[PDB]
């Protein structure tokens, strides 16, 4: 390296802002895209580091190399601060979330060249920074289908198979973590619904990448869990549970409308359904219309089947001559 | 996981007998906007509480220096600063001795 | 609870630089009245 | 020779990564003493600035006293 | 390269001395688990031949 250089570089790395801000103003020979041992420059030891303070006075450079790879990384760090004022860059003027603008050398880039800054804010579930990105208009781009044979897909396939993989588990990893899925649609619990199934389907197809498909489907199955943990009273638990009661059509006889409750069980969620608020609202239509026979002890329950059992032919009686009446309708009760 | 396993398969259970189907046993079955409202409320919730969790984690090494960086900076800031107060100062107080 | 502490120095940062920035500009419009005073 | 360039960009990545691993490590009793250790020379440096900066200057504003 | 054959090397040595057995079993161990990772960080068909 050199003298100036050197200074400059350790300057900016160890948060001494006057050192910096003065070679900045009266050097006009250090280029500021000196690199270290590691080929870091200024910009990306200061991000590294979370100096704010530095990670400005540098960001006001013109001729200032690897932004794009000092947001990337002050992403992947969290530092809230760091990466609003990397975003202030005109470079990322309208967006560029959506080549080489995130290498963080010569040859190669820091993450995934397929790892955009939404990608990695979701990645990373920094909610403060997914909440700015989306903001702006960042979308993970919801990869095609496994066996999708249009053209862009296929010329992915045959240029690196191996790196075309690894982009679309990239992608899912995106779009199942609890970040991405409550910050960019309106119906997170029926989004991480599908999106549990149909990563789910994906591990089955995908035997090389079964294990991660299977890990970020349980993503979406522990998402829709803890959103229900939360509920607090019987409308928001109904709002987890049944869904837009509003717009749902009905439950048959009085029923609170089992549509997502069903789809839930074909996922198997296992949780969800499971869960105590869940196994209340159950519980309330299994013993539909007999409140008494829930308190009562698994003994009296014994007794209640053999006593139905010996009056059997007249229940059945009493079904045909009088399906509409108080014993018809306690029988067609589901626990009956 | 076996209290959820069970739990599930018991769900499954119900849910047969929730439809209307049938009633009689085998041997007589021979003869004949609020809502989007609800969800902004937990879904702040769920960021709050999503938040706190990951305060609850443990610290590492890299968050330490990061600290430890910030206390590095302010040295700089400071030692300088405090340096050109008097800088400035002693050339001023040179003035007025100069003037006398 | 890192964070808390780490929040401790960033609000002393703007104590102390507001502070000694203060007192310097408080110093020098004296000095400035010095001056004129000559 | 794109096998040198290959594992140099593959060494560089694994030094990168190996420092990461190396920070998610938790924090012990030893780096936060040094930590707090740097807090105890920030404070003797300052202090002892701020005091000498006094010192030098209200000497000369008894010199302009003296001078009156 | 360097790893493999260092981790060949502490294997064997491991069989030789008894008393660093578990020693050099450890450190044989080391040399597989960093190809192991070098391996982990490929990302493409040319950096994983
Ligand atoms: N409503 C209702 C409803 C009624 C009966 C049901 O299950 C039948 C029952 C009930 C008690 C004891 C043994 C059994 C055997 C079941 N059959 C059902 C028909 C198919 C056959 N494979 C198994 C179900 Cl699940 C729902
Ligand atoms: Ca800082
Ligand atoms: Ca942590
Ligand atoms: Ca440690
Ligand atoms: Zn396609």
């Given at each position: 390296?050199?003298?100036?250089?050197?200074?400059?570089?350790?300057?900016?790395?160890?948060?001494?802002?006057?050192?910096?801000?003065?070679?900045?103003?009266?050097?006009?020979?250090?280029?500021?895209?000196?690199?270290?041992?590691?080929?870091?420059?200024?910009?990306?030891?200061?991000?590294?580091?979370?100096?704010?303070?530095?990670?400005?006075?540098?960001?006001?450079?013109?001729?200032?190399?690897?932004?794009?790879?000092?947001?990337?990384?002050?992403?992947?760090?969290?530092?809230?601060?760091?990466?609003?004022?990397?975003?202030?860059?005109?470079?990322?003027?309208?967006?560029?979330?959506?080549?080489?603008?995130?290498?963080?050398?010569?040859?190669?880039?820091?993450?995934?060249?397929?790892?955009?800054?939404?990608?990695?804010?979701?990645?990373?579930?920094?909610?403060?920074?997914?909440?700015?990105?989306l903001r702006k208009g960042a979308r993970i781009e919801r990869p095609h289908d496994?066996?999708?044979?249009?053209?862009?897909?296929?010329?992915?396939?045959?240029?690196?198979?191996?790196?075309?993989?690894?982009?679309?588990?990239?992608?899912?990893?995106?779009?199942?973590?609890?970040?991405?899925?409550?910050?960019?649609?309106?119906?997170?619990?029926?989004?991480?619904?599908?999106?549990?199934?149909?990563?789910?389907?994906?591990?089955?197809?995908?035997?090389?990448?079964?294990?991660?498909?299977?890990?970020?489907?349980?993503?979406?199955?522990?998402?829709?869990?803890?959103?229900?943990?939360?509920?607090?009273?019987?409308?928001?638990?109904?709002?987890?549970?049944?869904?837009?009661?509003?717009?749902?059509?009905?439950?048959?006889?009085?029923?609170?409308?089992?549509?997502?409750?069903?789809?839930?069980?074909?996922?198997?969620?296992?949780?969800?359904?499971?869960?105590?608020?869940?196994?209340?609202?159950?519980?309330?239509?299994?013993?539909?219309?007999?409140?008494?026979?829930?308190?009562?002890?698994?003994?009296?329950?014994?007794?209640?089947?053999?006593?139905?059992?010996?009056?059997?032919?007249?229940?059945?009686?009493?079904?045909?001559?009088?399906?509409?009446?108080?014993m018809g309708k306690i029988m067609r009760g589901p626990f009956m | 996981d076996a209290?959820?396993?069970?739990?599930?398969?018991?769900?499954?259970?119900?849910?047969?007998?929730?439809?209307?189907?049938?009633?009689?046993?085998?041997?007589?079955?021979?003869?004949?906007?609020?809502?989007?409202?609800?969800?902004?409320?937990?879904?702040?919730?769920?960021?709050?509480?999503?938040?706190?969790?990951?305060?609850?984690?443990?610290?590492?090494?890299?968050?330490?220096?990061?600290?430890?960086?910030?206390?590095?900076?302010?040295?700089?800031?400071?030692?300088?600063?405090?340096?050109?107060?008097?800088?400035?100062?002693?050339?001023?107080?040179?003035?007025?001795?100069?003037?006398?």
């Amino acid at each position: 390296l050199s003298i100036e250089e050197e200074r400059f570089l350790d300057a900016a790395e160890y948060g001494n802002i006057p050192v910096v801000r003065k070679m900045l103003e009266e050097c006009h020979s250090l280029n500021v895209n000196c690199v270290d041992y590691m080929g870091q420059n200024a910009l990306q030891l200061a991000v590294a580091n979370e100096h704010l303070e530095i990670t400005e006075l540098l960001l006001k450079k013109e001729n200032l190399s690897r932004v794009g790879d000092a947001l990337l990384l002050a992403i992947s760090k969290g530092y809230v601060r760091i990466v609003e004022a990397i975003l202030s860059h005109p470079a990322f003027a309208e967006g560029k979330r959506l080549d080489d603008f995130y290498a963080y050398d010569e040859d190669g880039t820091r993450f995934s060249h397929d790892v955009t800054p939404i990608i990695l804010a979701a990645h990373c579930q920094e909610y403060e920074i997914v909440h700015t990105l989306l903001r702006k208009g960042a979308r993970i781009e919801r990869p095609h289908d496994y066996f999708c044979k249009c053209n862009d897909c296929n010329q992915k396939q045959k240029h690196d198979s191996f790196s075309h993989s690894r982009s679309r588990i990239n992608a899912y990893k995106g779009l199942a973590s609890p970040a991405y899925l409550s910050l960019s649609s309106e119906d997170p619990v029926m989004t991480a619904l599908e999106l549990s199934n149909e990563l789910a389907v994906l591990a089955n197809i995908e035997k090389e990448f079964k294990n991660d498909y299977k890990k970020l489907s349980m993503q979406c199955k522990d998402f829709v869990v803890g959103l229900l943990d939360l509920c607090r009273n019987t409308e928001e638990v109904e709002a987890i549970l049944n869904g837009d009661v509003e717009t749902l059509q009905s439950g048959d006889h009085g029923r609170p409308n089992l549509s997502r409750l069903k789809l839930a069980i074909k996922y198997e969620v296992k949780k969800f359904v499971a869960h105590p608020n869940c196994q209340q609202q159950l519980l309330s239509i299994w013993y539909e219309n007999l409140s008494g026979l829930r308190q009562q002890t698994m003994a009296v329950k014994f007794l209640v089947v053999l006593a139905v059992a010996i009056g059997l032919p007249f229940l059945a009686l009493i079904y045909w001559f009088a399906p509409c009446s108080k014993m018809g309708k306690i029988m067609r009760g589901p626990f009956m | 996981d076996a209290d959820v396993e069970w739990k599930f398969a018991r769900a499954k259970l119900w849910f047969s007998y929730f439809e209307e189907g049938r009633t009689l046993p085998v041997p007589f079955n021979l003869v004949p906007r609020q809502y989007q409202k609800i969800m902004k409320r937990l879904i702040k919730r769920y960021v709050l509480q999503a938040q706190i969790d990951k305060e609850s984690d443990e610290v590492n090494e890299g968050e330490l220096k990061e600290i430890k960086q910030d206390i590095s900076s302010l040295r700089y800031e400071l030692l300088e600063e405090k340096s050109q107060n008097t800088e400035d100062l002693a050339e001023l107080i040179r003035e007025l001795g100069e003037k006398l």
